[PDB]
Amino acid sequence: MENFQKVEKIGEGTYGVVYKARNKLTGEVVALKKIRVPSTAIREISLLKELNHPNIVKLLDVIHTENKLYLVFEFLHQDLKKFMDASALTGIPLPLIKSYLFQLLQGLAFCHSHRVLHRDLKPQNLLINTEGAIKLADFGLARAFVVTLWYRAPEILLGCKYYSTAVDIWSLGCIFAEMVTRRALFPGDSEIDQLFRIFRTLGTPDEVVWPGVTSMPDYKPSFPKWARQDFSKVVPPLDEDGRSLLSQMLHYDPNKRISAKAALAHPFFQDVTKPVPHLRL
Ligand SMILES: CNS(=O)(=O)c1ccc(N/C=C2\C(=O)Nc3ccccc32)cc1
């Protein structure tokens, strides 16, 4: 669009490139996403514009010109990944971790109530500002249409084609653990490796802990049998309230995994506050 001046490439995505750009007709700074056009996609994207919430990156406009699609979003200066790297030596203080988690759950609860899944949550999709807020980006873009498998729910890796809102809670749980320990929970480099790293930590699932798991499309009776490890070993500094919530976010059975709404009332958030982080832009 000749109506936008590309400032710089912010990065590539699962559905296109993202640029920081200025709207020559408004002077506004925005995030321009050039998508890499089906009618359903246009309508699916159209719904996302009505999805307004303080913890969701706002979709400002949809420009469909010359059979090409560009999405205009609000712009935030930093993603959680860069923030974690910058805090690698000291770690993110618990009060801030708690604040970010609490806000993300509010965001997810809102999206889920409208039946909008993410299905691709990860640090690069979480944006923060100088105000202490954090927002979900690239929401609901999955349905409308090497990649990291570190945050993928087990039901997805096992071939379930009708996943639910529970897949986002799983990803959030992985991110939660990563902020606390400062290291990826399940850093797999292939689908099977990802699955096995999960099994080696939470134990290989069976019919007892996950009814119907052995009927999943990609389930194999030949999977190695690993025992479950203790969470005190997995996320050390995290207190009992935190470990309790994390475990409910990482239940194998999607139906027993905690929902965003229920997680918001968990004791872990009893003392939540909204600290302002020290950001270097
Ligand atoms: C990786 N470098 S960084 O931290 O400087 C950095 C800076 C800005 C952004 N912003 C990205 C985005 C933004 O603001 N709005 C979006 C809507 C959809 C997808 C990505 C975005 C992401 C990362």
Q: Which residue of the set 120, 189, 218, 239 is catalytic?
A: 120
DSSP string, 269-280: GTT---------
Q: Whose CA is nearest to atom 3 of ligand 1?
A: 78
SS3 125: helix
CB atoms closer than 10 angstroms to residue 60? 16
* Distance in angstroms (rounded) separating the CA atoms of residues 144 and 51: 15
120 annotated active-site = yes
The Cα-based distances of 155 to 130, 163, 180, 193, 201 in angstroms read: 36, 7, 25, 15, 16
- ∠ Cα 126 189 103 (to 5°): 15
Two tokens at 254?
């999607």
The Cα-based distances of 123 to 61, 173, 184, 249 in angstroms read: 24, 12, 11, 17
**Comparing C-alpha atoms, which of 65, 128, 61, 63 is closest to residue 92?**
128
The minimum-distance atom of ligand 1 relative to the CA of 59 is: 17
- Greatest CA span in the chain, whole angstroms? 61
Sheet strands side by side (includes 68-74)? 4-12, 16-23, 29-35, 68-74, 59-65
* Distance in angstroms (rounded) separating the CA atoms of residues 179 and 23: 35
- Distance in Å, CA 153 to ligand 1 centroid: 24
C-alpha dihedral sign at 69, 75, 80, 86: positive
Please name the CATH architecture into which domain 78-279 falls. Orthogonal Bundle (1.10)
DSSP code of 206? -
The Cα-based distances of 94 to 78, 232, 279 in angstroms read: 20, 17, 16
Q: Which of 10, 71, 124, 134 to mutate to test the pocket of ligand 1 (most atoms within 8 A of CB)?
A: 10
Domain boundaries, the chain: 1-77, 78-279
CB atoms closer than 10 angstroms to residue 92? 20
* Distance in angstroms (rounded) separating the CA atoms of residues 97 and 272: 10
For residues 32 and 4, the answer to whether their CB atoms sit within 8 Å is yes
For residues 184 and 150, the answer to whether their CB atoms sit within 8 Å is yes
CB atoms closer than 10 angstroms to residue 176? 25
Two tokens at 64?
């469909």
SS3 152: coil
Q: Left, alpha or beta for 83 (phi > 0: left; psi -120 to 50: alpha)?
A: alpha
Buried b (16+ CB within 10 A) or exposed e, 140-157: bbeebeeebbbbbbbbbb
21 lines ligand 1 (CB under 6 A): no
* Distance in angstroms (rounded) separating the CA atoms of residues 59 and 34: 13
For residues 107 and 127, the answer to whether their CB atoms sit within 8 Å is no
* Distance in angstroms (rounded) separating the CA atoms of residues 139 and 117: 7
| Burial (CB count within 10 angstroms: exposed 0-12, middle 13-18, buried 19+), residue 269 | middle
Residues in binding site for Mg(2+) = 125, 138
3-state DSSP: the chain helix, strand, coil percent, rounded to 5? Answer: 35, 15, 50
* Distance in angstroms (rounded) separating the CA atoms of residues 174 and 168: 10
Residues followed by a gap in the chain, C→N > 2.5 Å = 36, 145
Q: State the amino acid at position 86 in one-letter form.
A: A
57 lines ligand 1 (CB under 6 A): yes
79 lines ligand 1 (CB under 6 A): yes
Query: In Å, what resolution does this model reach?
Result: 2.2
Q: Which of 28, 57, 85, 127 to mutate to test the pocket of ligand 1 (most atoms within 8 A of CB)?
A: 127
- ∠ Cα 245 168 70 (to 5°): 145
C-alpha dihedral sign at 40, 41, 43, 47: positive
H helices of the chain, in order, are 39-48, 80-86, 94-113, 141-144, 154-157, 166-181, 191-202, 231-234, 240-249, 260-263
* Distance in angstroms (rounded) separating the CA atoms of residues 22 and 12: 19
Element containing residue 62 per DSSP (H, E): strand 59-65
Two tokens at 61?
């406009």
80 lines ligand 1 (CB under 6 A): no
Give the CATH number of domain 1-77; options: 2.40.50.40, 3.30.200.20, 3.20.20.140, 3.40.50.300.
Answer: 3.30.200.20
* Distance in angstroms (rounded) separating the CA atoms of residues 145 and 38: 9
For residues 100 and 84, the answer to whether their CB atoms sit within 8 Å is no
